[PDB]
Amino acid sequence: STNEGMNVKKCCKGFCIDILKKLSRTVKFTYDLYLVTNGKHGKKVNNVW
């Protein structure tokens, strides 16, 4: 019923995590990693992604 929540810190490993870490080794950018809370990958629901 409400839209208030918390930002839980969670660990991330895997293939794309290694891709991101090696790109940070090469391109030298600091990642700002978080998860999606809107939902799934993406779909244009009535001209709204």
Binding site: F15, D18, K22, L23, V27
Partner: protein
């Protein structure tokens, strides 16, 4: 590859499908396109991507194992021998009428 028992197997190797890939989506107008593309080609160009694929892809269930799946039974073989048997019944009828 992590299928316990090697039961669930895909159809071949993806022949009759969309045949696409994965990439990194950026905003329309980002200046980081070319450097990230050259870095991805560098990761392809040295096998470091292949090292990560070796690390992060299981490969135990190989393609078309010759395991215990032969259940000591065929149905079609004695079915065709029964078709030959029905032909033998027909030839017996032909030799019996004359």
């Amino acid at each position: 590859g992590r299928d316990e028992g090697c039961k669930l197997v895909t159809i071949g190797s993806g022949y009759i499908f969309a045949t696409t890939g994965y990439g990194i989506a950026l905003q329309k107008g980002s200046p980081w396109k070319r450097q990230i593309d050259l870095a991805l080609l560098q990761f392809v160009g040295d096998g470091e991507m292949e090292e990560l694929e070796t690390l992060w892809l299981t490969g135990i269930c190989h393609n078309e194992k010759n395991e215990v799946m032969s259940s000591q039974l065929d149905i079609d073989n004695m079915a065709g021998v029964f078709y030959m048997l029905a032909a033998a019944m027909a030839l017996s009828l032909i030799t019996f009428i004359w």
